[PDB]
RNA sequence: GAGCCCUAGCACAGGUGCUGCAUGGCCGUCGUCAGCUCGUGCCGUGAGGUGUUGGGUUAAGUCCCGCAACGAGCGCAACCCCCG
């Protein structure tokens, strides 16, 4: 239901391509592929939720952000599902560090927008 | 008696005399060449860098694509005149 949900074919991937910070994650080397070990995976996914949770039930918004093709379609999907923002193109400088700048431009978007009819 | 005009005296005028390395203003010139910058972000101990390195395209930093940058300004172009 979970985790044999998740090993449906949503587990391993890299193949010694790897960052050896992540060796706590991973449960063997499967055929020169590095199989990440979902019992823990479990443990994660229950702290994070958690803390999603806990963000959402107190107006908490979360940016989701994903711009490799594998990925670009599913993040706006599931972000619109549920009315928090994304990045899926390009992810600009500064959108954070510099957001005061990268908005203003938000702001011509929709008096762009506003030339439409 | 005020304009006004000559005589002498007083202040002063006059100087195309010097310095274009004391200057303003205006002009030439590189060059109508496609450049030169800024604000915030980010990188760097720092000068500084990115933006404005790359690929394409244009008469052009013109436009496109890309990208730790997102924009903007002086330029380019357009707004002006002539010719068709
Ligand atoms: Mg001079
Ligand atoms: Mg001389």
Do not use: C
């Not at 080397?29 to 590095?34: A, P, S």
């Not at 823990?40 to 908490?60: P, Q």
């Not at 093709?69 to 928090?84: L, N, S, T, W, Y």
Request: net charge positive; no cysteine.
């Amino acid at each position: 239901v979970k985790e044999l949900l998740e090993a449906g074919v949503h587990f391993g991937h890299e193949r010694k391509r790897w960052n050896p910070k992540f060796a706590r994650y991973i449960y063997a080397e499967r055929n020169g592929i590095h199989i990440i070990d979902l019992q823990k995976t479990m443990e994660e996914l229950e702290r994070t939720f958690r803390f999603i949770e806990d963000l959402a039930m107190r107006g908490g918004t979360i940016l989701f952000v994903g711009t490799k093709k594998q990925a670009q379609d599913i993040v706006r999907m599931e972000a619109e599902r549920a009315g928090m923002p994304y990045v899926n193109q390009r992810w600009l400088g500064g959108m954070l560090t510099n957001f005061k700048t990268i908005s203003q431009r938000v702001h011509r978007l929709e008096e762009l927008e506003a030339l439409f009819a």
